[PDB]
Design a protein around this nucleic acid. Structure first.
Ligand SMILES: [Mg+2]
Ligand SMILES: [Mg+2]
Ligand SMILES: [Mg+2]
Ligand SMILES: [Mg+2]
Ligand SMILES: [Mg+2]
Ligand SMILES: [Mg+2]
Ligand SMILES: [Mg+2]
Ligand SMILES: [Mg+2]
Ligand SMILES: [Mg+2]
Ligand SMILES: [Mg+2]
Ligand SMILES: [Mg+2]
Ligand SMILES: [Mg+2]
Ligand SMILES: [Mg+2]
Ligand SMILES: [Mg+2]
Ligand SMILES: [Mg+2]
Ligand SMILES: [Mg+2]
Ligand SMILES: [Mg+2]
Ligand SMILES: [Mg+2]
Ligand SMILES: [Mg+2]
Ligand SMILES: [Mg+2]
Ligand SMILES: [Mg+2]
Ligand SMILES: [Mg+2]
Ligand SMILES: [Mg+2]
Ligand SMILES: [Mg+2]
Ligand SMILES: [Mg+2]
Ligand SMILES: [Mg+2]
Ligand SMILES: [Mg+2]
Ligand SMILES: [Mg+2]
Ligand SMILES: [Mg+2]
Ligand SMILES: [Mg+2]
Ligand SMILES: [Mg+2]
Ligand SMILES: [Mg+2]
Ligand SMILES: [Mg+2]
Ligand SMILES: [Mg+2]
Ligand SMILES: [Mg+2]
Ligand SMILES: [Mg+2]
Ligand SMILES: [Mg+2]
Ligand SMILES: [Mg+2]
Ligand SMILES: [Mg+2]
Ligand SMILES: [Mg+2]
Ligand SMILES: [Mg+2]
Ligand SMILES: [Mg+2]
Ligand SMILES: [Mg+2]
Ligand SMILES: [Mg+2]
Ligand SMILES: [Mg+2]
Ligand SMILES: [Mg+2]
Ligand SMILES: [Mg+2]
Ligand SMILES: [Mg+2]
Ligand SMILES: [Mg+2]
Ligand SMILES: [Mg+2]
Ligand SMILES: [Mg+2]
Ligand SMILES: [Mg+2]
Ligand SMILES: [Mg+2]
Ligand SMILES: [Mg+2]
Ligand SMILES: [Mg+2]
Ligand SMILES: [Mg+2]
Ligand SMILES: [Mg+2]
Ligand SMILES: [Mg+2]
Ligand SMILES: [Mg+2]
Ligand SMILES: [Mg+2]
Ligand SMILES: [Mg+2]
Ligand SMILES: [Mg+2]
Ligand SMILES: [Mg+2]
Ligand SMILES: [Mg+2]
Ligand SMILES: [Mg+2]
Ligand SMILES: [Mg+2]
Ligand SMILES: [Mg+2]
Ligand SMILES: [Mg+2]
Ligand SMILES: [Mg+2]
Ligand SMILES: [Mg+2]
Ligand SMILES: [Mg+2]
Ligand SMILES: [Mg+2]
Ligand SMILES: [Mg+2]
Ligand SMILES: [Mg+2]
Ligand SMILES: [Mg+2]
Ligand SMILES: [Mg+2]
Ligand SMILES: [Mg+2]
Ligand SMILES: [Mg+2]
Ligand SMILES: [Mg+2]
Ligand SMILES: [Mg+2]
Ligand SMILES: [Mg+2]
Ligand SMILES: [Mg+2]
Ligand SMILES: [Mg+2]
Ligand SMILES: [Mg+2]
Ligand SMILES: [Mg+2]
Ligand SMILES: [Mg+2]
Ligand SMILES: [Mg+2]
Ligand SMILES: [Mg+2]
Ligand SMILES: [Mg+2]
Ligand SMILES: [Mg+2]
Ligand SMILES: [Mg+2]
Ligand SMILES: [Mg+2]
Ligand SMILES: [Mg+2]
Ligand SMILES: [Mg+2]
Ligand SMILES: [Mg+2]
Ligand SMILES: [Mg+2]
Ligand SMILES: [Mg+2]
Ligand SMILES: [Mg+2]
Ligand SMILES: [Mg+2]
Ligand SMILES: [Mg+2]
Ligand SMILES: [Mg+2]
Ligand SMILES: [Mg+2]
Ligand SMILES: [Mg+2]
Ligand SMILES: [Mg+2]
Ligand SMILES: [Mg+2]
Ligand SMILES: [Mg+2]
Ligand SMILES: [Mg+2]
Ligand SMILES: [Mg+2]
Ligand SMILES: [Mg+2]
Ligand SMILES: [Mg+2]
Ligand SMILES: [Mg+2]
Ligand SMILES: [Mg+2]
Ligand SMILES: [Mg+2]
Lengths: 100, 92, 88
RNA sequence: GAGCCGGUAGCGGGCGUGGAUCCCUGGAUGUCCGAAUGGGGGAACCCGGCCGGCGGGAACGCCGGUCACCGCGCGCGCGGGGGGAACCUGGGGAACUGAAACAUCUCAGUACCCAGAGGAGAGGAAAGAGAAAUCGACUCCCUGAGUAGCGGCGAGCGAAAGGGGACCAGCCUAAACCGUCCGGCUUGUCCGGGCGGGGUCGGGGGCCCUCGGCCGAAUCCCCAGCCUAGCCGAAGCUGUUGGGAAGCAGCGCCAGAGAGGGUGAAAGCCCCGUAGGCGAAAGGUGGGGGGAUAGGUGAGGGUACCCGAGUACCCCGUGGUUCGUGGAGCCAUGGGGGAAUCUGGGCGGACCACCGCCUAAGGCUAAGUACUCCGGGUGACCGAUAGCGCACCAGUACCGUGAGGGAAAGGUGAAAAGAACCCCGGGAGGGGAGUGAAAUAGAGCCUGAAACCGUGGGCUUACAAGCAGUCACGGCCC
RNA sequence: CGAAUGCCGGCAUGAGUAACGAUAAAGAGGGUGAGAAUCCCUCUCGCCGUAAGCCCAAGGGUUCCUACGCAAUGGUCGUCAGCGUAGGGUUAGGCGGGACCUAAGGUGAAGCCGAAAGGCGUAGCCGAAGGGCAGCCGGUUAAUAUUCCGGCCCUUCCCGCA
RNA sequence: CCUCUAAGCACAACCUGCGGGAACCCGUACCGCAAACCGACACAGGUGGGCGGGUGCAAGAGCACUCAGGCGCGCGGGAGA
């Protein structure tokens, strides 16, 4: 509904914060909190588990949601918002112009 | 609507003692809930059930609201002496 | 009371007075209470077969007009419905 | 059109670009109670009958139908029954109040109860209004007008005409007569009963021979359009302090879009959007647009046929209208007397005579108007004691037998990164470590005042007296 | 905003003060536990014993029982609890009700009367710790037991045979 | 329950035994003179029925003690105004 947004599980630039400009991979959309996770915010989760298994070695702990109004998608371009081209039967996301 | 009656058995330390005389107490569908579910247990487990009893159990609970699940009827078969079968002896 | 061929009863005020009255001298009123003027009602008995009405007794000639009839039908036992719906 | 399996956080369990999750529309299943409707019932439960189905079985079972009561027509069938925040009509209908007491009166035909009805209801086509050789249905709004009036002529209540507007529309029925038909009888070339045909101030109609003649529904199928999902929707990059930029600066760009929200803050150009423009297979919806149907086309002159009956009119009793008995008409009508059908009948405010007006005792009739449970937007509307009583799991907890009353209770941060690991402790709670920009932002956690309660420091008091202060000096740490 | 014996919220003071809810009454030794007069056990002591003991209805509803707990509730403490968490637990042809009956009283076809709501009311139906109806004794787990089981007996119905 | 006949059936229908079968819904835990009911309280109050032992005093559901059973009343320790 309103909950649909920029893009889906592809590679995408983030222009947010500390990671102002970082091309991350496939992004794993959240989106009820309107975020993705993609590759940027990598903050440490100081948690054991809920089920006590394979205990604490190091923390290379996982990512964070990264609110999705700052993940600029990519094509042979940089940024350039998505658009809709329909071609009489489909609905494809073509950027401000390069292609694709 | 014959296998929508016998809802579930109960693993319990009392209904492990049902295998010495009289086969195990199932939670039955607490409405449409007759003691003549003998043709709901022998049509399900291919036995010849002599006697069935009946109940009404399982009241309240906290965490903000009441009635722990349901109030489901549950009872048994006093099925004929050793047609007691149908792999039930697992867990007890 | 009832209706059977007419409209139901009404509600009146009373309007007492204690005076001389205008064409003599000064007038007045006293107390405006609700007399409840139940209309004139008479159980009338006619011989369709045994039929009974609560008719208004300014309408007893009207129910005899309703009886001076032959509405083509025999007895179900009670039948004032066909006498009152074949009224005009 | 790529993520989902609701408010999921956890079992990990699956499911999706051969189309899911969702949203809308149409079905299906809808247990039980409830108008409850098979009967009973202390609602959510019991107990049935008939038919059809599973030693699953003839007995107890369960399934799926059907079994209330009332109203309308010919055992047979179509409706009704209850609910709804207000809105409306009718039947009833107070009292506190005000009169500076109070009874008439007012409050008030208000509140409330009951019935009814629907998206509206009401009313409605003149037996009208009242001064004009006039207006021409009804309703609503503004004027009229606080006028005319009513009024213990006190308190107060208070029109209507006219005139501006909105809206617009007129019609069916015995305004008799002909045939039909169960039977009525004194078989009557005829009584009333159902239809049917006639009938609506070439003043009306029916009947008697000139002169022949289609407008258009409120009703019906249609179609836009409207909703009920949505969709496409323009254009900004870099550097900078920073936790973070959109802030600042430079170089731009869109604009039928510079409404707003969120984005780590201050974003026209990141997102959602907005301007603008598309979109309905399915259902509701709707002459707004055109289509047909149903209906409408004794103009004449006559033989006095018919123009709605216990009704009009008169009296008694009252209500309504401005009208409280008054000079009391009118409109309704509870009692009593009781007519005529156009040289009829009513009205024009006692009444009477002229002059007018208009046809009662049968019914329907859109539209404009009131309303706001509902959906949307709008705010010199509120921002958690406010706004609804409820921003939150609230008509809840709690109180009450009951009707009923009826609360409080929002905010971590950008993101849970919601504190791994130690150490004390039984744990709670801490102290480290860690997170984060910030942790006296650490979890019912933003800011977090004051009352209050502590701890540390300065001055000060144990021969003092006071509405606690103030002025004056003096002493002592800043 | 300073007053309304104002309202809502907070915190005082009273105050470590009155009380702690029966003048039936406690004492000790072991446990358990981090911690104990309060929990468990033992051994005395006391108290009721026409109850302060058992059983059933009324009512309350899971308080029952077991295990993990102790912030909260226990007028103290608490390892305990009836409190929190989770899991178990209530078995009936014979007990009590309904597939039976009526009493008062409801409801109520018919019928009556009311402006409407509705008020009556015959039959009928509902209506119960009253009538009627077939059960006694023992054991078992942590909880149920006239229900489970063991013995003996009995009742209704339906079918078949005589 | 016993009985008599109407309707009806007298190829039924009841009755007595003997064989088999079927026996449904709800209640059932626990407290129940109380810390679990009613009194805002683990409240000295209220609460219906049944059993309510023994010995003694003339009897007794009294009273005194005490079986069985159940409690010491969910604050105590002092001191001796
Ligand atoms: Mg498609
Ligand atoms: Mg049972
Ligand atoms: Mg509980
Ligand atoms: Mg007067
Ligand atoms: Mg009055
Ligand atoms: Mg008479
Ligand atoms: Mg889910
Ligand atoms: Mg699909
Ligand atoms: Mg699907
Ligand atoms: Mg769905
Ligand atoms: Mg089905
Ligand atoms: Mg029913
Ligand atoms: Mg009933
Ligand atoms: Mg019931
Ligand atoms: Mg078969
Ligand atoms: Mg069969
Ligand atoms: Mg049925
Ligand atoms: Mg029809
Ligand atoms: Mg209704
Ligand atoms: Mg008054
Ligand atoms: Mg007064
Ligand atoms: Mg007075
Ligand atoms: Mg008035
Ligand atoms: Mg209308
Ligand atoms: Mg009308
Ligand atoms: Mg007219
Ligand atoms: Mg006006
Ligand atoms: Mg006018
Ligand atoms: Mg006008
Ligand atoms: Mg017109
Ligand atoms: Mg005739
Ligand atoms: Mg006609
Ligand atoms: Mg002629
Ligand atoms: Mg069309
Ligand atoms: Mg179109
Ligand atoms: Mg849409
Ligand atoms: Mg778009
Ligand atoms: Mg855009
Ligand atoms: Mg900065
Ligand atoms: Mg902003
Ligand atoms: Mg901020
Ligand atoms: Mg913005
Ligand atoms: Mg648009
Ligand atoms: Mg359509
Ligand atoms: Mg279509
Ligand atoms: Mg319509
Ligand atoms: Mg007329
Ligand atoms: Mg007369
Ligand atoms: Mg007159
Ligand atoms: Mg006067
Ligand atoms: Mg004349
Ligand atoms: Mg007239
Ligand atoms: Mg006139
Ligand atoms: Mg007159
Ligand atoms: Mg005049
Ligand atoms: Mg209308
Ligand atoms: Mg209007
Ligand atoms: Mg809204
Ligand atoms: Mg404000
Ligand atoms: Mg605001
Ligand atoms: Mg608040
Ligand atoms: Mg509030
Ligand atoms: Mg606040
Ligand atoms: Mg709530
Ligand atoms: Mg209560
Ligand atoms: Mg935040
Ligand atoms: Mg800790
Ligand atoms: Mg705080
Ligand atoms: Mg704070
Ligand atoms: Mg100090
Ligand atoms: Mg001195
Ligand atoms: Mg001194
Ligand atoms: Mg002095
Ligand atoms: Mg104050
Ligand atoms: Mg004052
Ligand atoms: Mg003041
Ligand atoms: Mg206070
Ligand atoms: Mg205090
Ligand atoms: Mg003192
Ligand atoms: Mg003291
Ligand atoms: Mg004391
Ligand atoms: Mg003693
Ligand atoms: Mg003793
Ligand atoms: Mg226990
Ligand atoms: Mg504590
Ligand atoms: Mg405590
Ligand atoms: Mg322990
Ligand atoms: Mg517990
Ligand atoms: Mg038995
Ligand atoms: Mg019995
Ligand atoms: Mg039954
Ligand atoms: Mg009965
Ligand atoms: Mg009786
Ligand atoms: Mg009655
Ligand atoms: Mg009956
Ligand atoms: Mg009984
Ligand atoms: Mg009895
Ligand atoms: Mg027990
Ligand atoms: Mg028991
Ligand atoms: Mg015996
Ligand atoms: Mg059986
Ligand atoms: Mg028991
Ligand atoms: Mg007792
Ligand atoms: Mg007790
Ligand atoms: Mg209590
Ligand atoms: Mg009290
Ligand atoms: Mg106590
Ligand atoms: Mg007590
Ligand atoms: Mg007593
Ligand atoms: Mg003695
Ligand atoms: Mg005694
Ligand atoms: Mg105590
Ligand atoms: Mg003493």
């Amino acid at each position: 509904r309103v909950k649909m947004h920029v893009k889906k599980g592809d590679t995408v630039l983030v222009a947010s914060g500390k990671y102002k400009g970082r091309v991350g991979k496939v992004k794993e959309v959240l989106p009820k909190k309107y975020a993705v996770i993609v590759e940027g915010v990598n903050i440490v989760k100081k948690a054991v588990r809920v089920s006590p298994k394979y205990p604490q070695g190091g923390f290379i702990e996982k990512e964070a949601p990264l609110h999705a109004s700052k993940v600029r998608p990519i094509c042979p371009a940089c940024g350039k918002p998505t658009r809709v081209r329909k071609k009489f039967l489909e609905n494809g996301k073509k950027i401000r112009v390069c292609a694709k | 609507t014959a296998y929508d009656v016998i809802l579930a058995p109960v693993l319990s330390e009392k209904a492990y003692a049902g295998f010495a005389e009289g086969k195990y107490t199932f939670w039955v569908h607490p409405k449409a809930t007759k003691t003549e579910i003998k043709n709901a247990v022998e049509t399900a487990f291919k036995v010849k059930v002599v006697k069935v009893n009946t109940l009404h159990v399982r009241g309240k609970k906290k965490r903000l609201g009441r009635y722990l699940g349901k109030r489901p009827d549950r009872k048994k078969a006093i099925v004929q002496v050793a047609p007691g079968q149908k792999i039930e002896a697992l867990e007890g | 009371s009832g209706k059977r061929p007419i409209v139901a009863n009404s509600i009146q005020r009373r309007g007492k007075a204690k005076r001389e009255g205008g064409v003599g001298k000064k007038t007045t009123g006293i107390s405006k209470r609700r007399q409840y003027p139940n209309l004139q009602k008479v159980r009338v008995r006619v011989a369709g077969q045994e039929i009974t009405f609560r008719v208004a007794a300014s309408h007893i000639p009207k129910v005899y007009e309703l009886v001076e009839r032959a509405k083509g039908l025999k007895l179900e036992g009670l039948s004032p419905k066909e006498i009152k719906k074949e009224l005009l």
